[PDB]
Nucleic acid binder design. Structure first.
Lengths: 333, 218, 335
DNA sequence: CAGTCATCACCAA
DNA sequence: GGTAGACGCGGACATCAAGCCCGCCGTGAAGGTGATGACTG
């Protein structure tokens, strides 16, 4: 018995892209007609402020480049001077059926995987995963640099059945933290909805609205476009900010990253905050990888031990494996 | 040489006799070039001369297949002939070697560096834009006949497209210059015609047996 | 062992907004909530050729005709109105805290050694030395670049906003405070400890800085000018274009931020000349001179890696410079 | 004891 | 609900210096042919 050479898992917890608008507090419950924060291109006189190479360090050019200016063109978005509040709105579907692959080569391995996932589900649900996703919705983790030093953050979540709304939550996103998962009774009512979405019991569509009191005319931070394979002249643009039609925006995959920062079960520094759910636990912006292949805690060891050889891990690693299957990917050999 | 895919290695040993000497036609017939350096007996020389005739001669019976094309053609006052077309391996090898010296190579790229040095005297290079590639076999093309020496399952297809299948959008709205300033037809494909009418207006009539029949259609 | 990180990044601290200009009468300063803005105006001008002459087209009739003929140009201009005499300039300022912690890195051990170095700085000397010089540049009106040269009275009103409404109000007189010396008193040091609490994460700091510069009736004010660059235009249609927001002349936020960090009086030429802006290879570019060269080993890229990697702490004066470059930000990496 | 069905090495810039 | 008949000339359009660094670019499946080898009815 081997694992299949083709495995494809669809993503669950599928969010849209979020769009930005601006206004003032005490109008935030009449905030349906706020104008969008716009993308503005500007040009910058600056200074040569990089390290200087010593490999062709001619002092005729290198000692003289410091004294002369540096001209760059960037992009920037701000709040208006009339307004002091960022608004971010996106939607979220919770699908369910989170153990059945969409593409396979074996059938015995598929039945073994489905009965393994059913063994996981019919003694503990998705509740430990669902309340961790409900934590990351309840605080405003998805506001990445925008909440940093924000004075007050409010997160509103609406459950939507038709044109009318069915259930509404309100929060204080700064009371809820980024390193704890201590909750109350109000967040458990969101966790049970997400756990009824992940188990296929119901249809779940959510509208997440976050308000951040930042300041008059201060700078907001939309997502920056990866511009790849250019081959151009002297940096005609060096920062392009992502927008949709006349509205600054955040990519859907960055919000999707912020929702699945669930993993407090990694070996070395589990007391040092949750990271995202990756197969090799890698945080790239910090330049290291928790859950190496050498310490047998990555997904491609635990999955193969638990599905094939009937070597069930600890429950805290079972949550990691089921989180990797809610994520999705190409897990084939 | 089409045949068994796991048997096309002895064909290299049989066809190396057209390399070096002129004794490729010495193995089957004219075995005086296969007696002195062959070093085999009469049974071995006869067996080699018999087995080497089965390449150029027939291998099997003349037939067709259900996955073949076999088109119909109407006759002038009769029924039909079935036309089963074939793949011209010899012709595609010739045009493929002909185009690999015309798109790249020594002269067709040294003339491009001569253009890149901006100092060129007249010498002809060739450029084939917007081709297409087709693969035969797949990851392993040696099951097909040879398709490996410098083909590698990559017959290069020349473009034969229509002219007007890559158009733009029509925007003649109620604009302050998109209504009145749009009385000329500012399109993107008239630059070649304007450049031709410009750069074909300086030559005299000292060679005027051909240039006086182009402005009649322009 | 222990080389530098190939990717380093530091988010800025002390982020200002765009300063919008408006105009009105002095002694109506405390009713200045509805003053109309200073608007940018387009004008055409008839100068002479007051420029130098090249001589690659030298002829006695070319250059004489070029001098004796007029010059026709088209510029922008901003003026106070014909009844107002005071320039109101208003922006906000956020102070964040968490200075030495980078936002992106590669080497984990270098990251931990950098945080150990910065944490060893912060406790035996707080942020107060940097915060009082920042509070000096908020106290005088250094952010008024040309609009205070020759101004009669300059008046700064810094509010601290911890709710919808102000909780704490200041009022300075920016001409009695110099531009050359860092001398303080009992009203400036309260702003200094507010900024020092903000830089060390001990609270929420948001300010609303309003400056009032009595200039005169109808005089020209000087909003920021921007680059219309990397085009290669025809005719040179606009030799000067003034920055604005929705119908209001303004100063770029980075020029205000430039003025707020003229702190550096430790560069090895002199300190009595005045401070310069903290930036690596400390260079004023409008003067063409780069103080603090990499030759005399005093720039940020030498001080930082001798202090972090090899434990060679610099002078205590230069540690304020290194921490000021960390408050600034930037992209640091492989040499 | 003879057709037929899954596998098996054979090549290959 | 009135035709009527005309719209100017000349001249000129700025010069200077400068344009960033660092890391990285995914995996799985896409072969026909005899030749025994095992099955064999």
């Amino acid at each position: 018995l081997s694992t299949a050479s083709v495995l494809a898992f669809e993503r669950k917890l599928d969010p849209s892209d979020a769009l930005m608008s601006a206004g003032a507090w005490a109008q935030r419950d009449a905030s349906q007609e706020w104008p969008a924060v716009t993308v503005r291109e500007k040009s910058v006189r600056g200074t040569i402020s990089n390290r200087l190479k010593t490999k062709d360090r001619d002092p005729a050019k290198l000692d003289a480049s410091i004294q002369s200016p540096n001209l760059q063109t960037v992009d920037v978005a701000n709040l208006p001077s009339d307004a002091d509040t960022l608004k971010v709105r996106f939607t979220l579907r919770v699908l369910g059926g989170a153990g059945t692959p969409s593409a396979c080569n074996d059938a015995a391995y598929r039945d073994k995987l489905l009965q393994t996932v059913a063994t996981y589900v019919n003694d503990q649900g998705f509740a430990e995963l669902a309340r961790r996703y409900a934590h990351n919705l309840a605080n405003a983790r998805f506001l990445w640099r925008n909440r940093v030093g924000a004075e007050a953050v409010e997160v509103r979540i609406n459950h939507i059945r038709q044109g009318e709304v069915a259930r509404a939550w309100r929060f204080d996103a700064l009371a809820i933290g980024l390193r704890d998962f201590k909750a109350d009774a109000e967040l458990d009512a969101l966790a049970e909805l997400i756990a009824s979405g992940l188990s296929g019991s119901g249809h779940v569509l959510l509208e997440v609205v976050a308000f951040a009191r930042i300041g008059d005319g201060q700078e907001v931070f939309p997502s920056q476009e990866l511009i790849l394979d250019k081959g151009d002249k002297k940096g005609q643009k060096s920062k392009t900010l992502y927008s949709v039609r006349d509205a600054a925006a955040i990519h859907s995959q960055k919000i999707g990253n912020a929702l699945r920062t669930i993993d407090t079960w990694y070996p070395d520094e589990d007391g040092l905050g949750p990271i995202a759910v990756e197969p090799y636990g890698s945080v790239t912006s910090q330049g290291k990888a928790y859950r190496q292949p050498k310490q047998k805690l990555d997904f491609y060891t635990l999955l193969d031990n638990w599905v094939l050889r009937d070597e069930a891990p600890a429950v805290e690693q079972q949550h990691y494996v089921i989180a990797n299957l809610i994520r999705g990917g190409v897990f084939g050999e | 040489v089409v045949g068994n895919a796991a048997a096309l290695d002895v064909f290299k040993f049989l066809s190396l006799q057209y390399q070096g000497k002129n004794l490729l036609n010495w193995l089957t017939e004219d075995s005086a070039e296969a007696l002195q350096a062959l070093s085999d007996n009469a049974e071995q020389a006869r067996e080699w001369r018999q087995a080497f005739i089965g390449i150029t001669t027939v291998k099997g019976a003349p037939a067709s297949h259900s996955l073949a094309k076999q088109l119909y053609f109407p006759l002038p006052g009769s029924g039909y002939h079935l036309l089963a077309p074939l793949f011209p391996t010899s012709l595609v090898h010739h045009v493929h070697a002909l185009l690999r010296e015309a798109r790249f190579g020594d002269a067709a790229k040294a003339a491009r560096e001569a253009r890149s040095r901006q100092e060129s005297w007249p010498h002809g290079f060739s450029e084939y834009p917007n081709l297409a590639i087709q693969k035969f076999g797949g990851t392993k093309p040696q099951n097909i006949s040879q398709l490996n020496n410098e083909r590698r399952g990559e017959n290069w297809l020349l473009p034969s497209l229509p002219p007007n299948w890559q158009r733009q959008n029509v925007n003649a709205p109620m604009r302050h210059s998109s209504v009145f300033e749009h009385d000329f037809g500012r399109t993107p494909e008239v630059s070649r015609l304007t450049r031709t009418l410009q750069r074909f207006l300086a030559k005299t009539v000292h060679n005027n047996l051909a240039i006086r029949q182009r402005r009649a259609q322009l």
